[PDB]
Design a protein around this ligand. Structure first.
Ligand SMILES: C=C1/C(=C\C=C2/CCC[C@]3(C)[C@@H]([C@@H](C)CCCC(C)(C)O)CC[C@@H]23)C[C@@H](O)C[C@@H]1O
Length: 255
């Protein structure tokens, strides 16, 4: 039954543009991480919230990593076909509302099921759940985040699908404050059609089975993680002197 229309010339170009955009904005060697404020891991085997908030030992490093990542995501977004056709206001609304979700998606590349960490170098740049608690977050965010990373890993996405998913995540017409939802939807549909077509024509079985719907579900999971992250960030920001441990960009995007 299922027809397999071939990718159009345009669709092939969209894929190539997104792959190039990602390769220019995601360094798989994590060579810039030593430039961030250093990671510090206080002794907290008991997971004390009082101690974690008192020290926020991993916050400067993780805030720098997230801030750096937001800058890369802004650059990636600017290369998404159609993104620059949007008004500046809609572009900023889309970037601010998707930032954390795209960070969670793109981070899957360093996440490894070998030990359930984001491995970005030697021990210094190996990030574990215990590091996230040392940055002021709790299990309500961490648990679903790790579950999401593993679920995404097991989809065994082609790089083409991974970059398309990030682009679709950014160009979402259902974000609060967007003006031209119709144009945003048109841009997203062009990307979704490219993704659906790619899966049916280039993704071998059995990993291709209902893969599109699995990818769409991950976009829904991301909305939930976004909301929880926002709630936790708000509370984290109540800690006196927290602003110094963050960055101006992080403060704007999540404040
Ligand atoms: C960033 C990237 C990477 C890892 C992501 C991680 C591991 C550390 C903790 C992070 C950054 C989680 C955060 C929710 C931690 C809290 C952030 C904050 C303090 C601002 O509220 C989400 C994704 C997680 C590394 C590399 O893949 C580039 C990528 O781009």
């Amino acid at each position: 039954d299922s027809l397999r229309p071939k990718l159009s010339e345009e669709q092939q170009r969209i894929i190539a543009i997104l792959l190039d955009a990602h390769h220019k904005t995601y360094d798989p060697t994590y060579s810039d991480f030593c430039q961030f404020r250093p990671p510090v891991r206080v002794n907290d085997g008991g997971g004390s919230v009082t101690l974690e908030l008192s020290q926020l030992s991993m916050l400067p490093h993780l805030a720098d990593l997230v801030s750096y990542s937001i800058q890369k995501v802004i650059g990636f977004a600017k290369m998404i076909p159609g993104f620059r056709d949007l008004t500046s206001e809609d572009q900023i609304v889309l970037l601010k509302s998707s930032a954390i979700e795209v960070i969670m998606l793109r981070s899957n590349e360093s996440f490894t099921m070998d030990d359930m960490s984001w491995t970005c170098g030697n021990q210094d740049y190996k990030y574990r759940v215990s590091d996230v608690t040392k940055a002021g977050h709790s299990l309500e965010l961490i648990e679903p985040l790790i579950k999401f990373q593993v679920g995404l890993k097991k989809l065994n996405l082609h790089e083409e699908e991974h970059v398309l998913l990030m682009a679709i995540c950014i160009v979402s017409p259902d974000r609060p404050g967007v003006q031209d939802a119709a144009l945003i939807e048109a841009i997203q549909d062009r990307l979704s059609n490219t993704l659906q077509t790619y899966i049916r024509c280039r993704h071998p079985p059995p990993g291709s089975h209902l893969l599109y719907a699995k990818m769409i579900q991950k976009l829904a999971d991301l909305r939930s993680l976004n909301e929880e992250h926002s709630k936790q960030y708000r509370c984290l920001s109540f800690q006196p002197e927290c602003s110094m441990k963050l960055t101006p960009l992080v403060l704007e995007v999540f404040g």
